[PDB]
Amino acid sequence: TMSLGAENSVAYSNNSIAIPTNFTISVTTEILPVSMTKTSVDCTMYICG
């Protein structure tokens, strides 16, 4: 049975905050298709030659 994620319990309280003291410059890739191969079929030649 597949796990959904690592279990994290957020330390919530009514008067506590978490402030970052540092940062990471993260570069991620996103691949998106744009076009296909332009195909033309001669219908008469395909059916009959």
Ligand X SMILES: *[C@@H]1O[C@H](CO)[C@@H](O[C@@H]2O[C@H](CO)[C@@H](O)[C@H](O)[C@H]2NC(C)=O)[C@H](O)[C@H]1NC(C)=O
Which residue number, 18 or 31, has a Cβ lying nearer to ligand X?
Answer: 18
> How far is residue 5's CA from residue 3's CA, in Å, rounded to a whole number?
6
Which residue number, 1 or 22, has a Cβ lying nearer to ligand X?
Answer: 22
Which residue number, 10 or 31, has a Cβ lying nearer to ligand X?
Answer: 10
Q: Provide, rounded to whole angstroms, the least separation between the CB of residue 20 and ligand X.
A: 10
How many CB atoms sit inside 10 A of residue 2's CB? Answer: 3
DSSP state of 11: -
The footprint of ligand X on residues 8-27 (CB under 6 A) is 9, 11, 18, 21-22
